Amino acid sequence: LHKEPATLIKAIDGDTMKLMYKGQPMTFRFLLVDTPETKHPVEKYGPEASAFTKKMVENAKKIEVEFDKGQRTDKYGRGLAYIYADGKMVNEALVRQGLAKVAYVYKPNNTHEQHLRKSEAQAKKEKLNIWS
């Protein structure tokens, strides 16, 4: 895998955002996690996950996207990637806080699964947020 540059256009919610990628606006959806819904057609911690993500990416110097080794988009046309804000993976950061659960694990796009699962285990052992 490798990291590629992108530019933040707009934070959407905990696990989805608009980025400029190779000169084109796209929706990206984080691999391997699910944050609570803000706009369910509010779930608890939805607002908190959205705010955490928005702050992390809006404050960043540099945003990067890292595709996994399979599909790079979902059926909605969303980019599927690990997003990094100044070198810190946002997907992992949310899970470490108990603001996302590890979810949507679709092979072959599961390279960081164990990593995320170990963060989730710690967040649950610390009883944070979703696990409180």
Pick one of 8, 47, 74, 113: the residue that binds ligand THP (CB under 6 A): 74
Kindly state whether residue 34 participates in binding Ca ion, applying the rule CB under 5 A. Answer: yes
SS3 call for 30: strand
34 in a labelled binding site: yes
Pick one of 6, 21, 29, 67: the residue that binds ligand THP (CB under 6 A): 29
Kindly state whether residue 113 participates in binding Ca ion, applying the rule CB under 5 A. Answer: no
CA 110 vs CA 32, 113, 118: distances in Å:
7, 5, 14
Instruction: Tell how strand 33-34 and strand 24-30 pair up.
Output: unpaired
* Exposure b/e, 47-79, CB count within 10 A at least 16 = b: ebbbebbbebbeebeebbbbbbeeeeebeeebb
35 in a labelled binding site: yes
Pick one of 6, 17, 31, 94: the residue that binds ligand THP (CB under 6 A): 31
User: Tokens at residue 91, please?
Assistant: 């997907």
Which one, 36 or 98, has the nearer CB to ligand THP?
36
Kindly state whether residue 66 participates in binding Ca ion, applying the rule CB under 5 A. Answer: no
Read off the amino acid at residue 10: K
Q: Which residues bind ligand THP (CB under 6 A)?
A: 16, 29, 31, 34, 74-75, 80, 104, 106
Annotated binding site: 15, 34-35
